Amino acid sequence: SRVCQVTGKRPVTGNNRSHALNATKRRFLPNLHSHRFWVESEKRFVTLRVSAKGMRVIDKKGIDTVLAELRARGEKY
Amino acid sequence: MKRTFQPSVLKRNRSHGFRARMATKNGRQVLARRRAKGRARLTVSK
Amino acid sequence: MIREERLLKVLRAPHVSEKASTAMEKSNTIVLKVAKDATKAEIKAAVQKLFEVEVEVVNTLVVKGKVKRHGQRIGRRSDWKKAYVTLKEGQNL
Amino acid sequence: KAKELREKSVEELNTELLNLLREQFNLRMQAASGQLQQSHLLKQVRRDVARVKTLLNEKAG
Amino acid sequence: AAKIRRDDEVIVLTGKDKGKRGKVKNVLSSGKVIVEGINLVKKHQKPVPALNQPGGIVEKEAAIQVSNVAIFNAATGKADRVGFRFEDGKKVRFFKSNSETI
RNA sequence: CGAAGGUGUGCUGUGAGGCAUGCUGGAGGUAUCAGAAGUGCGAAUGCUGACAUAAGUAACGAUAAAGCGGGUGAAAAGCCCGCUCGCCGGAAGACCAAGGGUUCCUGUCCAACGUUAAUCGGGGCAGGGUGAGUCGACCCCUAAGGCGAGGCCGAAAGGCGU
RNA sequence: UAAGGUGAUAUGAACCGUUAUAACCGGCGAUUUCCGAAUGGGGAAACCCAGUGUGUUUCGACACACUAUCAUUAACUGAAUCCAUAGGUUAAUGAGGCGAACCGGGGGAACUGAAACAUCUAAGUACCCCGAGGAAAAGAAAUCAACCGAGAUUCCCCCAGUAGCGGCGAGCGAACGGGGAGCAGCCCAGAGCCUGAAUCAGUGUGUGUGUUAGUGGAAGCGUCUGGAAAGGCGCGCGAUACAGGGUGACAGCCCCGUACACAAAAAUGCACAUGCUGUGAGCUCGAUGAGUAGGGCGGGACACGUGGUAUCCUGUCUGAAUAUGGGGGGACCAUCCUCCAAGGCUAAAUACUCCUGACUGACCGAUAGUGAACCAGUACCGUGAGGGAAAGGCGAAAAGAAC
Ligand SMILES: [Mg+2]
Ligand SMILES: [Mg+2]
Ligand SMILES: [Mg+2]
Ligand SMILES: [Mg+2]
Ligand SMILES: [Mg+2]
Ligand SMILES: [Mg+2]
Ligand SMILES: [Mg+2]
Ligand SMILES: [Mg+2]
Ligand SMILES: [Mg+2]
Ligand SMILES: [Mg+2]
Ligand SMILES: [Mg+2]
Ligand SMILES: [Mg+2]
Ligand SMILES: [Mg+2]
Ligand SMILES: [Mg+2]
Ligand SMILES: [Mg+2]
Ligand SMILES: [Mg+2]
Ligand SMILES: [Mg+2]
Ligand SMILES: [Mg+2]
Ligand SMILES: [Mg+2]
Ligand SMILES: [Mg+2]
Ligand SMILES: [Mg+2]
Ligand SMILES: [Mg+2]
Ligand SMILES: [Mg+2]
Ligand SMILES: [Mg+2]
Ligand SMILES: [Mg+2]
Ligand SMILES: [Mg+2]
Ligand SMILES: [Mg+2]
Ligand SMILES: [Mg+2]
Ligand SMILES: [Mg+2]
Ligand SMILES: [Mg+2]
Ligand SMILES: [Mg+2]
Ligand SMILES: [Mg+2]
Ligand SMILES: [Mg+2]
Ligand SMILES: [Mg+2]
Ligand SMILES: [Mg+2]
Ligand SMILES: [Mg+2]
Ligand SMILES: [Mg+2]
Ligand SMILES: [Mg+2]
Ligand SMILES: [Mg+2]
Ligand SMILES: [Mg+2]
Ligand SMILES: [Mg+2]
Ligand SMILES: [Mg+2]
Ligand SMILES: [Mg+2]
Ligand SMILES: [Mg+2]
Ligand SMILES: [Mg+2]
Ligand SMILES: [Mg+2]
Ligand SMILES: [Mg+2]
Ligand SMILES: [Mg+2]
Ligand SMILES: [Mg+2]
Ligand SMILES: [Mg+2]
Ligand SMILES: [Mg+2]
Ligand SMILES: [Mg+2]
Ligand SMILES: [Mg+2]
Ligand SMILES: [Mg+2]
Ligand SMILES: [Mg+2]
Ligand SMILES: [Mg+2]
Ligand SMILES: [Mg+2]
Ligand SMILES: [Mg+2]
Ligand SMILES: [Mg+2]
Ligand SMILES: [Mg+2]
Ligand SMILES: [Mg+2]
Ligand SMILES: [Mg+2]
């Protein structure tokens, strides 16, 4: 549904603002991409729909750390 | 002159019948309102 | 086969009438008023047993309850089943 | 008459049920043909069948 | 517990025949009593062959308010009231003016 | 030994009003001094009910059409029986589907219903009546289309679809 | 508990009962068709059609049980593909649906006001959606204050229509501080001392104390009027009972109650006493929350409309220090003071009433009061969502008018 599987980032709402300060509603979507992540420690690829920010989490924590967090919450991959 | 109500029992049921109502969140709210009011007959379904 | 408890329920009454009288003294048919859910087979069984006659065939139909009034009230009598039961050849009861 | 039959065997009142049921039927017919002036009777068998089937129900359980 | 019962002998307190006595005949759930030869009425009665054959007029008893009758002592020869106590295990009724069981 | 309410008559105050009493009614009423308001109606093409007016006036729904004799009946232009006359006949005849649901048949009744009368009725009341291996449904098989395990997609609700 | 009973319109007929297996009242059981989440498959709701067992048969048939989906766990099994993995089957456990308000969260109008209207207002309101509990939510300071000090959260009264915000228009509108209600604090990021030691929790035990039927419950007569006396007149009595209701007109003493005093075979609520069953207290030393705080860009929340604008949240791109450290004190800097974010849990004061009992009203009394005092969400209207009435009173007693 356009939800980052790593972080949780989903669409949020807010306002366009003109020079005359007319406000119309809008959405701010995440920067999602489907991406095959190599897991060394079970010799396969896993595909997560993830946001640019969630990829920086995976670089830092390491995929094995992150896929433990995914299993906890019971979100499938 | 042909008038607006041309009866058909099959169409009455597929449209306004009990199971039709039960098949949608909106239709289930119709039966919930009609029970709440106290209606003696929820739907058309003889 | 059918258990007897059941059989004791499926017959409900004899049904009198001009037509029933005639049916009896012409085509050797007894006209009963039977349980709404009783199959033809259960009727045949129940008669054979509970009256000790022999039954050729049963016919059945469903009578619809008439709508009535009782002083500005709407009523409705119950639907009920009517069996025509032809016996074999020479029995009577 | 509950105690009068509370003690008698499973089979004993298993046979009691059927001849109650048989009487119910016989009443039903005579009633239906205006040969029953004792209406109260067919009410009583009904309540007897009731209290047999209950007694069956506890023993079996 | 009911203070006055079937087959009691009572004196009328109130109404067209104040003062006069009779036996209780049967007791209604409305809180009324039939009392033999008390509240007599003249019912006009239509004929009907099967039950109550002829026409004719009738006298019969009409129900009377039970509050309007009193258990009659027949020792004082006067109206009375009823209490409740146990004479050895069984609730009983006693006059109050003369505390004897009845 | 007659409350409120209703309807008369008499008296009385500058006014909104007050007091007395006949008849009706058949169980409530409230001096005084204070207190509180759903506190006063002729109008809003006001709202609800009732009753007038036009007026015993227009009308009684296809211009296919009736006439007489008998019957029953409190009563017959209209009902029943008969004779004659008329109208439809690719329908104004007959059988069905859909839709309706006892309107079907007998007996009984004429208050209301029937644009009149009604002994008559699709009206009231009671009783009867619908019988299937082969007719139809159900059943087997699919069309458009619908629902749709997993699935794909979407803030949620949901949307598509194997 | 009892001398009367078989619910109403509603009689009648057949019966049942009177000293206790008649009826009636309460506790625990039994039975409980079909449809409906509906769950064996289907379906135009209350119907159509099955599969597998186990049992039975008069060989025609019969009765009962089980069989939905998803989530988790376990076993068994298992492709492309060697190990695997995905998948498949069975079982166990749980969920599903309904419901009046209150509560937390995801979305989010316009009419209207500005005497036009776009910023602003209406308003984070109506409405839709998700989730929850008897309440929820919030909660033990990276909080305030002013160099004096205070000490978690919630709610009430003030401060104050003040300070501010504002096409500085219409309007919006705090805090600091003070007075009250209620009061409570703990735990993980970890090893030794060390135990069943704190007491949260589960399940039996007694004992109290409620609940669900019930029992006893004072004392008045005469006489007038009248259809009838409870009213008038006369003379008595009760009162821890003169609340209230009924009875042929207005009754402390006619009846039912009321004050007060009593009661439970059975089930269950709360509180102490408590075995046992999981449960860990105390002390020492250490540790102490990173794609995080901060930043740029776009928005939102703060009374505060980007303004000189601190503080909070983050869609997007970035990114520290780590106690010799870090956050805040309304641009910003220095000094000083105060606190320790990136991990949790927590009772009471507070919100509400679909429903149950009791009691109350300067609330209505049939065009009023609920739409509905009456068989009303009915009759009727509408394809449907939905709309939606009218209609109470014989008499004390039917004695409801024989002939
Ligand atoms: Mg706007
Ligand atoms: Mg045949
Ligand atoms: Mg048939
Ligand atoms: Mg008078
Ligand atoms: Mg008045
Ligand atoms: Mg007054
Ligand atoms: Mg005044
Ligand atoms: Mg007014
Ligand atoms: Mg007027
Ligand atoms: Mg005027
Ligand atoms: Mg006009
Ligand atoms: Mg004229
Ligand atoms: Mg003229
Ligand atoms: Mg004319
Ligand atoms: Mg004409
Ligand atoms: Mg004509
Ligand atoms: Mg003629
Ligand atoms: Mg004519
Ligand atoms: Mg049809
Ligand atoms: Mg009819
Ligand atoms: Mg006919
Ligand atoms: Mg006829
Ligand atoms: Mg006439
Ligand atoms: Mg007429
Ligand atoms: Mg007819
Ligand atoms: Mg298809
Ligand atoms: Mg699905
Ligand atoms: Mg979409
Ligand atoms: Mg689909
Ligand atoms: Mg007993
Ligand atoms: Mg099913
Ligand atoms: Mg289904
Ligand atoms: Mg099928
Ligand atoms: Mg698996
Ligand atoms: Mg739920
Ligand atoms: Mg909400
Ligand atoms: Mg606007
Ligand atoms: Mg304006
Ligand atoms: Mg204006
Ligand atoms: Mg909201
Ligand atoms: Mg709480
Ligand atoms: Mg919390
Ligand atoms: Mg200090
Ligand atoms: Mg008592
Ligand atoms: Mg007493
Ligand atoms: Mg007198
Ligand atoms: Mg007196
Ligand atoms: Mg009176
Ligand atoms: Mg911390
Ligand atoms: Mg930041
Ligand atoms: Mg900043
Ligand atoms: Mg910014
Ligand atoms: Mg400014
Ligand atoms: Mg700062
Ligand atoms: Mg900060
Ligand atoms: Mg400063
Ligand atoms: Mg944060
Ligand atoms: Mg309360
Ligand atoms: Mg209440
Ligand atoms: Mg009135
Ligand atoms: Mg009304
Ligand atoms: Mg309709």
From Swiss-Prot, chain A:
Matches recorded under SUPFAM superfamilies: L28p-like
BP GO annotations: cytoplasmic translation; ribosomal large subunit assembly
GO cellular component, one term: cytoplasm
Family annotation (InterPro entries): Ribosomal_bL28, Ribosomal_bL28/bL31-like_sf, Ribosomal_bL28_bact-type, Ribosomal_bL28_sf
Domain of life: Bacteria
GO molecular-function terms, A-Z: rRNA binding; structural constituent of ribosome
Keywords: Ribonucleoprotein, Ribosomal protein, RNA-binding, rRNA-binding
Any Pfam family hit: Ribosomal_L28
Family of this protein: Belongs to the bacterial ribosomal protein bL28 family.
Subunit composition and interactions: Part of the 50S ribosomal subunit.
PANTHER family linked: 39S RIBOSOMAL PROTEIN L28, MITOCHONDRIAL (PTHR13528), LARGE RIBOSOMAL SUBUNIT PROTEIN BL28M (PTHR13528:SF2)
NCBIfam families: L28
Annotated protein name in UniProt: Large ribosomal subunit protein bL28
Organism: Escherichia coli (strain K12)
From Swiss-Prot, chain B:
Molecular function via GO: structural constituent of ribosome
InterPro entries (alphabetical): Ribosomal_bL34 (IPR000271), Ribosomal_bL34_CS (IPR020939)
Source species of the chain: Escherichia coli (strain K12)
Family: Belongs to the bacterial ribosomal protein bL34 family.
Top-level taxon in the UniProt lineage: Bacteria
A cellular component term, taken from the record's GO annotations: cytoplasm
Protein name as it appears in the record: Large ribosomal subunit protein bL34
NCBIfam families listed in its UniProt record: rpmH_bact
The protein's assembly and partners: Part of the 50S ribosomal subunit.
A Pfam family the protein falls into: Ribosomal_L34
Keywords per UniProt: Ribonucleoprotein, Ribosomal protein
Family annotation (PANTHER family): LARGE RIBOSOMAL SUBUNIT PROTEIN BL34M, MITOCHONDRIAL RIBOSOMAL PROTEIN 34 FAMILY MEMBER
Gene: rpmH
GO biological process, one term: cytoplasmic translation
From Swiss-Prot, chain D:
Gene Ontology CC terms: cytoplasm; cytosolic large ribosomal subunit
Record field: transmembrane: none
Gene3D superfamilies: 6.10.140.1970
Keyword vocabulary terms for this entry: Ribonucleoprotein, Ribosomal protein, RNA-binding, rRNA-binding
Domain of life: Bacteria
Disruption phenotype: Cells missing both S17 and L29 grow very slowly and have a rather unstable temperature-sensitive phenotype.
GO BP terms: cytoplasmic translation; ribosomal large subunit assembly
Keyword Cell membrane: no
InterPro entries: Ribosomal_protein_uL29 (IPR050063), Ribosomal_uL29 (IPR001854), Ribosomal_uL29_CS (IPR018254), Ribosomal_uL29_sf (IPR036049)
NCBIfam families: L29 (TIGR00012)
Family to which the UniProt record says this protein belongs: Belongs to the universal ribosomal protein uL29 family.
Assembly: Part of the 50s ribosomal subunit. Contacts protein L23, trigger factor and protein nascent chains. Might also contact SecE and probably does contact SecG when the SecYEG translocation complex is docked with the ribosome.
Main function: Binds 23S rRNA. It is not essential for growth.
The name this protein goes by in its record: Large ribosomal subunit protein uL29
From Swiss-Prot, chain E:
InterPro entries reported in the protein's UniProt record: KOW (IPR005824), Rib_uL2_dom2 (IPR014722), Ribosomal_uL24 (IPR003256), Ribosomal_uL24_CS (IPR005825), Ribosomal_uL24_KOW (IPR041988), Translation_prot_SH3-like_sf (IPR008991)
Any one Pfam family match given in the protein's UniProt record, by short name: ribosomal_L24
Single Gene Ontology BP annotation: translation
Swiss-Prot/TrEMBL keywords: Ribonucleoprotein, Ribosomal protein, RNA-binding, rRNA-binding
Single GO term (MF): structural constituent of ribosome
SMART domains on file: KOW (SM00739)
Entries under PROSITE patterns matching the protein: RIBOSOMAL_L24 (PS01108)
GO CC term (a single one): cytosol
Matches recorded under HAMAP family: Ribosomal_uL24_B
Function: One of two assembly initiator proteins, it binds directly to the 5'-end of the 23S rRNA, where it nucleates assembly of the 50S subunit. It is not thought to be involved in the functions of the mature 50S subunit in vitro.
Binding partners and assembly: Part of the 50S ribosomal subunit. Might contact the SecYEG translocation complex when it is docked with the ribosome.
PANTHER family: MITOCHONDRIAL RIBOSOMAL PROTEIN L24 (PTHR12903)
Assigned protein family: Belongs to the universal ribosomal protein uL24 family.
Name under which the protein is recorded: Large ribosomal subunit protein uL24
Source organism: Escherichia coli (strain K12)
Lineage: Bacteria, Pseudomonadati, Pseudomonadota, Gammaproteobacteria, Enterobacterales
